[PDB]
Amino acid sequence: NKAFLNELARLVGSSHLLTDPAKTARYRKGFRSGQGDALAVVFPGSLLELWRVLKACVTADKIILMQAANTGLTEGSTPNGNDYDRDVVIISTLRLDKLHVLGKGEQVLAYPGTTLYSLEKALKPLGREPHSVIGSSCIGASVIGGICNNSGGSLVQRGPAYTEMSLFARINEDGKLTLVNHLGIDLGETPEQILSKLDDDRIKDDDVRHDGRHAHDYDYVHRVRDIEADTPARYNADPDRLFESSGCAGKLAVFAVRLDTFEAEKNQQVFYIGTNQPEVLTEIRRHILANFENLPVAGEYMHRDIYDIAELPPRMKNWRDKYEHHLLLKMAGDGVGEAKSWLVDYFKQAEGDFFVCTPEEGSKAFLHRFAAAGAAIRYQAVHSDEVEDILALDIALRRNDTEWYEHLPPEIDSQLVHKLYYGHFMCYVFHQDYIVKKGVDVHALKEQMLELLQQRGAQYPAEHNVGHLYKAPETLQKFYRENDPTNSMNPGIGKTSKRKNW
Ligand SMILES: Cc1cc2nc3c(=O)[nH]c(=O)nc-3n(C[C@H](O)[C@H](O)[C@H](O)COP(=O)(O)OP(=O)(O)OC[C@H]3O[C@@H](n4cnc5c(N)ncnc54)[C@H](O)[C@@H]3O)c2cc1C
């Protein structure tokens, strides 16, 4: 072991290797939960260094945990406990932060540390927008980390993060580390050639091939509008979005992804909708999905309790006081006039009301909605020895569900101090965080709640992935194994075996 570590320090430099528990704690603890021991955290500075570190880990038979930023919410980006059969090496990819724009910006090559934030910035002067907008973009979520988790932001027209074109390393059945270039870009024959070409930014449009594979989720547009389908719009175990790097959850080492970007959206307007009747929001969604020509850009839901705890903008304060259910509907281009006209008519009849945001209201509303997650976490710490731990569920309802707002069995409802509800309303993806009464068996509660969701036909992790909080369905387990036959990369994800060879 003294030798393996010296090799790492030789490959990335001693200032880019951490072994002291007190120093690695920063990378061993999950954003909301999850924690474990790790032998080392290494920070390669080039893709070629990443390759050599992976090779050194495979030859020392270590477990590899790829990490970018670590905003994963279900403990799947940090070690889970200490019972691994081999030492764990966390490879932080955050220094690999270059970005390569292809052509006029219609596609990009993102590297392991490229942040969504930097992607947004580089595309803006090109008149393009990224494929994803998630609550964690403001705190540095990475592009590749979202592809690995099939992340789903607030962007209603884009689907969960997805691409069939990527460059990644895979430990095969024989335990051999292999580099697989499925980027559809000619980069060379050896790892040195391929990775240097990319590290030196010597890729030009001439190296690029155009072949029909998809660099985003095609037709989510269609799937999201099908309000008569009896399955959800998107969920982590959805087999059609599990492709190589897409949904890999750390089971491969993703070096690069080729992704589609989109034309920037014209003139956006946020419509702040509030109501006390769940059915009024249900019909806004159903009518827009079935009848609008223009899909919204975003449609974020916030219940009042989560509103208060997340908590200023006076009109929002007014809406909070008047309405329990809020829908932040962002339209763009023509959808603005379409939404404004239909809402004016709809609310002359339907119970609540709405207003057209001022740039300041609109940004503060979204900033408030995001942060919902951090909220519950902080309410917990405040009331630590008085409430159990936070029970957080991530769910995707059947597209034709007529009752999205849950009415739990009275005996389950009574065990909750608070019920925090927020989500991506148009996609029927909801995050439900509960503050549970002191003395309640949280594990038993969760099990009861998961049974009710199965009964409702919902799927669960929707966007956050299974991590170590959810059991991976058969589709996922089979995918994880195909990618990592030796089970040497982020091992027990989805409550699966943590041991070598599974
Ligand atoms: C406040 C807040 C709001 C959020 N809002 C949303 C939201 O709206 N929608 C949503 O879907 N999620 C949301 N999330 C979760 C977030 O999307 C994920 O935490 C984020 O996408 C993960 O990106 P990351 O850079 O943090 O990756 P990390 O957490 O580091 O996690 C990466 C996951 O991918 C693996 N991985 C990372 N890099 C690589 C690589 N190069 N090769 C192979 N495997 C790799 C890791 O092992 C792990 O399984 C939120 C989290 C927070 C804290």
Side-chain angles (χ1 to χ4, degrees), residues 130-406:
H131 67 291
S132 167
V133 163
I134 55 171
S136 50
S137 292
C138 75
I139 50 161
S142 71
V143 174
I144 284 179
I147 284 301
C148 291
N149 269 170
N150 289 307
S151 71
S154 54
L155 256 38
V156 181
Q157 298 155 42
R158 309 317 166 199
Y162 175 85
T163 188
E164 301 167 347
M165 299 183 293
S166 69
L167 168 67
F168 60 91
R170 168 166 180 274
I171 299 182
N172 74 14
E173 302 67 24
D174 304 325
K176 185 73 183 183
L177 183 66
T178 65
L179 188 64
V180 175
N181 177 188
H182 285 352
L183 246 19
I185 306 177
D186 287 343
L187 265 12
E189 149 175 84
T190 64
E192 282 75 10
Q193 279 164 165
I194 292 158
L195 308 178
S196 74
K197 193 162 179 192
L198 293 179
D199 284 329
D200 298 342
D201 198 45
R202 288 191 325 274
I203 286 207
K204 288 308 174 183
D205 288 336
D206 218 274
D207 298 302
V208 189
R209 306 297 149 245
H210 299 81
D211 61 39
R213 283 124 108 209
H214 300 304
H216 70 283
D217 184 5
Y218 274 59
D219 114 293
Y220 175 80
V221 249
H222 319 176
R223 297 183 57 273
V224 76
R225 276 189 188 264
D226 193 355
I227 50 175
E228 300 303 337
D230 59 47
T231 62
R234 57 192 168 78
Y235 55 102
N236 288 282
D238 179 353
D240 292 325
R241 248 54 65 184
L242 295 183
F243 179 81
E244 263 169 353
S245 291
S246 298
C248 77
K251 268 68 164 66
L252 296 175
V254 185
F255 281 67
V257 295
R258 173 172 171 188
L259 302 172
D260 291 321
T261 70
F262 299 86
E263 230 176 61
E265 277 307 37
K266 290 307 177 67
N267 286 295
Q268 308 180 76
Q269 277 249 47
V270 171
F271 286 98
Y272 205 110
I273 300 165
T275 182
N276 291 294
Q277 306 187 351
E279 307 68 35
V280 46
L281 294 188
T282 300
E283 169 58 20
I284 290 177
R285 166 171 172 285
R286 278 193 122 224
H287 175 85
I288 285 173
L289 253 18
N291 312 304
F292 268 27
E293 286 185 289
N294 301 256
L295 292 175
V297 164
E300 299 290 318
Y301 165 76
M302 271 204 113
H303 176 90
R304 164 196 293 158
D305 308 318
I306 204 300
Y307 178 108
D308 300 337
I309 284 191
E311 203 169 55
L312 163 105
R315 288 164 113 192
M316 282 177 197
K317 303 184 189 184
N318 190 57
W319 256 238
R320 173 275 164 187
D321 296 318
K322 290 173 159 158
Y323 309 117
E324 171 186 344
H325 298 109
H326 292 184
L327 175 55
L328 295 186
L329 184 74
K330 198 193 292 216
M331 305 287 309
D334 290 2
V336 172
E338 205 180 6
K340 187 178 174 315
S341 157
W342 187 80
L343 294 164
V344 169
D345 268 50
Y346 182 70
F347 280 106
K348 67 177 45 289
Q349 181 121 78
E351 187 258 338
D353 204 356
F354 84 96
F355 63 83
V356 174
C357 300
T358 294
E360 317 81 83
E361 301 184 309
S363 68
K364 297 172 202 134
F366 271 85
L367 282 177
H368 189 238
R369 156 65 182 82
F370 298 156
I377 290 165
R378 274 166 263 182
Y379 171 96
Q380 212 291 163
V382 173
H383 297 60
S384 219
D385 196 315
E386 161 187 347
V387 292
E388 282 318 310
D389 226 318
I390 308 301
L391 205 194
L393 299 184
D394 180 41
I395 76 176
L397 308 184
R398 288 154 26 224
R399 279 165 281 174
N400 69 345
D401 199 333
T402 169
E403 329 254 298
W404 55 280
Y405 190 63
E406 70 175 11

Side-chain angles (χ1 to χ4, degrees), residues 29-35 72-75 78 469:
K29 164 194 195 159
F31 195 88
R32 180 164 60 202
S33 63
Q35 187 139 61
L73 283 175
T74 56
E75 318 184 339
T78 46
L469 289 190

